[PDB]
């Protein structure tokens, strides 16, 4: 299964993608790393992987959606079979997300369906809950709200701060992110026709 990395910024997750997909028993094979911000250290990792990178200024298009079909652009110029979101920060337009459903995972620093959206370290500190942990999910319309793949549980410690936290969580996040990707380029796991789940 071909796949493409999108980015935004370390690239933490892209790396842990990378490690596992040169594993020879792997069934995914990373063929683009693709970022809308540039200058950013996952496009560093990439680079020295080996991956062909391309940065997409989302300040260089009118519409949401001309952006996303540059992206889709590059997807199918690479014959890209699965995009996996690792850590990109903007938000996909309703069309692209359709045409790629069933193909997109995004890693997500929270138990969903508990806080959704963009600080969810910040989320689960004010709330003050003991566990929290990560969520690799098939990209749906509404945001966090797709089918789930995998998740890790990652206990929450006193005095935890967003450093802190994120730190612990992307432990876990480095694990299910590319198991969910195996998951999915080995064909264990699909969605199925009624968009649950379908383990196979
Ligand atoms: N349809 C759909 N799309 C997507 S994308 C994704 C990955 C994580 C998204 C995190 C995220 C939560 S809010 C937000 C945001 O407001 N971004 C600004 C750009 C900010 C900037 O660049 O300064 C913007 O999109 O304009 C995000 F980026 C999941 C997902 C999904 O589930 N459904
Ligand atoms: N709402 C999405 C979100 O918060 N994504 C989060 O951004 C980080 C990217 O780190 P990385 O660039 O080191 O992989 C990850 O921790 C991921 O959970």
């Given at each position: 299964?071909?796949?493409?990395?999108?980015?935004?910024?370390?690239?933490?997750?892209?790396?842990?993608?990378?490690?596992?997909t040169?594993?020879?028993?792997?069934?995914?094979?990373?063929?683009?790393?693709?970022?809308?911000?540039?200058?950013?250290?996952?496009?560093?990792?990439?680079?020295?992987?080996?991956?062909?990178?391309?940065?997409?200024?989302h300040?260089?298009?009118?519409?949401?959606?001309?952006?996303?079909?540059?992206?889709?652009?590059?997807?199918?110029?690479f014959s890209i079979?699965?995009?996996?979101?690792?850590?990109?920060?903007?938000?996909?337009?309703?069309?692209?997300?359709?045409?790629?459903?069933?193909?997109?995972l995004?890693?997500?620093?929270?138990?969903?369906?508990?806080?959704?959206?963009?600080?969810?370290?910040?989320?689960?500190?004010?709330?003050g809950?003991?566990?929290?942990?990560?969520?690799?999910?098939?990209?749906?319309?509404?945001?966090?709200?797709?089918?789930?793949?995998?998740?890790?549980?990652?206990?929450?410690?006193?005095?935890?701060?967003?450093?802190?936290?994120?730190?612990?969580?992307?432990?876990?996040?480095?694990?299910?992110?590319?198991?969910?990707?195996?998951?999915?380029?080995?064909?264990?796991?699909?969605?199925?026709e009624?968009?649950?789940?379908?383990?196979?």
């Amino acid at each position: 299964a071909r796949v493409a990395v999108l980015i935004s910024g370390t690239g933490s997750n892209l790396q842990a993608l990378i490690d596992s997909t040169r594993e020879p028993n792997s069934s995914a094979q990373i063929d683009i790393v693709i970022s809308n911000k540039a200058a950013v250290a996952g496009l560093d990792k990439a680079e020295r992987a080996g991956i062909p990178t391309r940065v997409i200024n989302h300040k260089l298009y009118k519409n949401r959606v001309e952006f996303d079909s540059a992206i889709d652009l590059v997807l199918e110029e690479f014959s890209i079979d699965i995009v996996c979101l690792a850590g990109f920060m903007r938000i996909l337009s309703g069309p692209f997300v359709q045409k790629w459903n069933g193909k997109m995972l995004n890693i997500h620093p929270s138990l969903l369906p508990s806080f959704k959206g963009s600080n969810a370290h910040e989320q689960a500190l004010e709330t003050g809950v003991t566990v929290t942990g990560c969520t690799v999910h098939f990209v749906a319309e509404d945001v966090d709200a797709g089918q789930i793949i995998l998740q890790e549980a990652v206990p929450v410690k006193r005095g935890d701060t967003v450093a802190t936290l994120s730190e612990r969580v992307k432990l876990a996040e480095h694990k299910i992110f590319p198991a969910a990707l195996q998951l999915v380029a080995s064909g264990t796991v699909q969605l199925g026709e009624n968009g649950k789940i379908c383990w196979v």
